[PDB]
Amino acid sequence: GTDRMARLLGELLVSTDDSGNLAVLRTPPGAAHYLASAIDRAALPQVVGTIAGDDTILVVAREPTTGAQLAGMFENLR
Amino acid sequence: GTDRMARLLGELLVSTDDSGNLAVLRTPPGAAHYLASAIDRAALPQVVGTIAGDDTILVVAREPTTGAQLAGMFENLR
Amino acid sequence: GGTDRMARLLGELLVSTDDSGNLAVLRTPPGAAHYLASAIDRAALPQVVGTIAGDDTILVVAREPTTGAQLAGMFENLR
Amino acid sequence: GTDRMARLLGELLVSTDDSGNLAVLRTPPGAAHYLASAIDRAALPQVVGTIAGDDTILVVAREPTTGAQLAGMFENLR
Amino acid sequence: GTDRMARLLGELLVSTDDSGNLAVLRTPPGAAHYLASAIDRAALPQVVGTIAGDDTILVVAREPTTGAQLAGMFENLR
Amino acid sequence: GTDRMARLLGELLVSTDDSGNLAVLRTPPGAAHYLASAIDRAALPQVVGTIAGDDTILVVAREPTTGAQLAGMFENLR
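^ Those are the sequences you sent over. The predicted structure of the assembly is below.
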């Protein structure tokens, strides 16, 4: 779960950002659904859910974790 | 209207979660768009909008309703 | 000229705007959300963190301390 | 599998059409993914696969069944 | 309806191609769904339906029109 | 381009099937757009294009290549 997510983050995470309870992950062109999917599958306790577009993922942080702390965690697995 | 919505939540709502102003609903694979659409057509005053993925819907709550209160409402409709 | 294209497309495709918290919620005609959302990305506004589109609706994430209501009124006035 | 499919065709199938090995199914807005996935889970021997947009499903007929034969089959099931 | 389709093909159609009863239209990424919807709404007599990816559209030709024929016609509307 | 596609098919391709000028490829849920962009970026001479659903890809074969031939080729690259 977590090791698959980690590898794919290393492959596919271009950048991260945050606002409030939200991390925003940028990926290459066809890649966001695929990444989002590995995140969901990892089922992180600090994560409520994810929604992907083509090249963007919204990851919803579980309180009290913030979007910034979620995004920092994702950075440090890449 | 709200009728179809309540009937679909009965059939399709697997689980709820929340964070901040967001309710995150989970459905069977391939059902999230269809349920999201029903929730839009109901046009509930406490919902601003929804975004569906394949089995996840992010519901944005209208202030002052929280994601938790929103999740609590979808869950008691079935 | 990313902003001008965004401005042109808001004029054409934006049906309604709304908000909650750090989120602006934009509505478009069916099939148009993804196209407008990418024009908004392309424009790289200082106060926008990112966007996610469905079929007819866009979530636009405001950069703190800009709020979703602020982003919404700004999109609204570009219509 | 096939009960669920046939029930959903009853609710959601608005119209059919065909060309060659292809059946085109129309649904109400937001209904096509849900219907498409019911069809997939039913695993019909005459179906090769499906792709859904918002209100349109492309069903690929297994040779020698035509798109017209596949479309006629889907209609008589409503 | 057809005018909007014509105007959009002029802005969004990058290239055209075909195979059998199929026209394949290419767009910029993020623009396929929007174009397909405009094609759909124009309801051309020789088009059975469309399905959009991200930057590609499958247009289904109504027999006896071919994909090459459709693609020619779309091509000359740019 | 082709080497990346070849790596991805080994990881993501679950089954191949076909009908007429179409190869139908199945991946795990959430992997189809990712594999489909890699197929596109390989630009194979015999492929007109691809459209991805959630776990299904339609690959359009270039006349006179058939979908069965494309499918058998993709199958042997796992």
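Chain B touches chain C at residues 20-21, 33, 36, 40, 48-52, 58, 60-63 (CB under 8 Å). The domain at 1-78 of chain B is CATH 3.30.1360.40 (Gyrase A; domain 2).

Shout if you want it in another format.
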